[PDB]
Amino acid sequence: MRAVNWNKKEDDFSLMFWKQNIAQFWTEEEIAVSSDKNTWVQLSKEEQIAYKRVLGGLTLLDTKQGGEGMPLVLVHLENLQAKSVLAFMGAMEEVHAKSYSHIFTTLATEEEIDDIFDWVDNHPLLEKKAGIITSYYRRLLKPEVTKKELYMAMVASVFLESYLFYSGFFYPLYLAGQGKLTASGEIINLIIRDESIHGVFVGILAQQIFAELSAEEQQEVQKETQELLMELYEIEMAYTEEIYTSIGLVEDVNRFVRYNANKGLMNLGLEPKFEEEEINPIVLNGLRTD
Amino acid sequence: MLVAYDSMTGNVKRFIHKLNMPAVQIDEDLVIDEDFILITYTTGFGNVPERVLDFLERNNEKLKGVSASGNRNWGDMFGASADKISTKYEVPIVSKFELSGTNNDVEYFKERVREIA
Numbered sequence: 001m002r003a004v005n006w007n008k009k010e011d012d013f014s015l016m017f018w019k020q021n022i023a024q025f026w027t028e029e030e031i032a033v034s035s036d037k038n039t040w041v042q043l044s045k046e047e048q049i050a051y052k053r054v055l056g057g058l059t060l061l062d063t064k065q066g067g068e069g070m071p072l073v074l075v076h077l078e079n080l081q082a083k084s085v086l087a088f089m090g091a092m093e094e095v096h097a098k099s100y101s102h103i104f105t106t107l108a109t110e111e112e113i114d115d116i117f118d119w120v121d122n123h124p125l126l127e128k129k130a131g132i133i134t135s136y137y138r139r140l141l142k143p144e145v146t147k148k149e150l151y152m153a154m155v156a157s158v159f160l161e162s163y164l165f166y167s168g169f170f171y172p173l174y175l176a177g178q179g180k181l182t183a184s185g186e187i188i189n190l191i192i193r194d195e196s197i198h199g200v201f202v203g204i205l206a207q208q209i210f211a212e213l214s215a216e217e218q219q220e221v222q223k224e225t226q227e228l229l230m231e232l233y234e235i236e237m238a239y240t241e242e243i244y245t246s247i248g249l250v251e252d253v254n255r256f257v258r259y260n261a262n263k264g265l266m267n268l269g270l271e272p273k274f275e276e277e278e279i280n281p282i283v284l285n286g287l288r289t290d
Numbered sequence: 291m292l293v294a295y296d297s298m299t300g301n302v303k304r305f306i307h308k309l310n311m312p313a314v315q316i317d318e319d320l321v322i323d324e325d326f327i328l329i330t331y332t333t334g335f336g337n338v339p340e341r342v343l344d345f346l347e348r349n350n351e352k353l354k355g356v357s358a359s360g361n362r363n364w365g366d367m368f369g370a371s372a373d374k375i376s377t378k379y380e381v382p383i384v385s386k387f388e389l390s391g392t393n394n395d396v397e398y399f400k401e402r403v404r405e406i407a
């Protein structure tokens with residue numbers, strides 16, 4: 001049985017991601033939110049509800065990715081250095097989830113927070129969305145898994161990392177880019193650079209597996225990947241309608257979802273599927289805090 | 291003009307392929323004798339990849355400008371590798387683009403290279 005030996009590299013990129021996770025972890029433990037109360041009380045009821053709800057959605061996706069997607073992906077990799085990178089990425093999804101709790105606590109009473117968690121738990125569209133992605137992970141709960149199964153879990157995982165989070169990421173960036181709730185925005189910004197490197201690393205792992213599939217196996221997972229992408233898109237358009245119509249931002253969000261979907265595909269080595277458009281400039285300004 | 295580049299996960303490589311310009315992946319032995327433009331990617335906290343820093347120690351005399359691939363998710367560190375090389379060798383930032391670039395970025399890059407020559 002093999003022990004991880006860092007003195008003989010198993011690939012060319014694992015060590016850099018190892019280091020990089022640790023350096024981002026470190027920047028995340030410096031300052032936090034409270035100053036936000038001033039702008040939080042200036043938002044309408046509908047805005048505060050959208051925010052709480054998206055953050056609820058983010059926390060659900062972080063929970064599933066730390067508690068399921070990273071562990072089940074890593075438990076089958078034969079490359080022990082990459083497996084260590086993932087264990088650490090997996091833990092970082094838990095740190096992010098805990099950050100969302102911290103933001104919640106500085107913005108709502110324990111009773112409101114609790115209602116938001118009840119809501120996320122019982123919300124059919126989030127169940128469905130989380131349910132589709134995690135069905136790729138659950139398929140790995142067995143002693144031996146095919147390359148195809150494992151490739152599809154990695155595609156699912158990058159669609160989560162680089163694409164599904166962005167329908168909720170939109171709002172805090174959009175507000176912060178207007179100088180509202182910018183301390184919470186700074187936390188999200190940090191979380192977003194973790195998630196971007198997670199989606200790059202898993203997408204490298206994916207492309208290695210894909211290179212070992214037969215031509216027939218490649219055509220099959222390419223089909224499933226395009227299906228999964230658009231099945232998710234269609235769920236996202238519906239989710240976007242539920243959360244944002246009250247505040248008039250539905251087509252802004254939808255366009256940001258396309259923009260990120262195309263980044264996720266590119267993490268996988270794939271061509272973009274949505275028409276290419278500039279990033280929302282107010283969101284860009286939110287990314288440009290500190 | 292000649293384009294020297296570095297790519298770790300393929301994005302920069304995919305962009306140079308849309309270019310129709312002669313272009314070469316840098317390595318440690320490489321010397322470039324003509325004017326060239328560098329395309330780099332960007333590594334953590336807006337930095338220049340080590341291979342690029344080495345290649346410029348030996349090849350900056352002919353460097354006429356620099357583009358960066360990055361990801362706007364990095365905020366004010368988006369593409370910052372171009373800023374650091376631009377400052378360090380007093381050459382123009384040709385452009386910054388995300389990932390493998392959009393057709394606008396490609397067209398933009400070419401126009402900037404004429405303009406710069």
Ligand SMILES: Cc1cc2nc3c(=O)[nH]c(=O)nc-3n(C[C@H](O)[C@H](O)[C@H](O)COP(=O)(O)O)c2cc1C
Nearest residue numbers: 297298299300301302331332335336360361368369
């Ligand atoms: C570990 C890591 C750190 C990164 N840091 C930055 C950054 O600081 N600024 C930036 O704009 N992009 C950053 N990126 C994004 C890459 O520069 C971008 O994906 C680039 O297209 C990759 O080029 P390549 O595929 O040719 O290697 C980073 C990516 C990784 C994996």
Ligand SMILES: [Cl-]
Nearest residue numbers: 196200360361
């Ligand atoms: Cl990226």
Ligand SMILES: [Fe+2]
Nearest residue numbers: 062092093096
């Ligand atoms: Fe996360």
Ligand SMILES: [Fe+2]
Nearest residue numbers: 161194195198
């Ligand atoms: Fe992640």
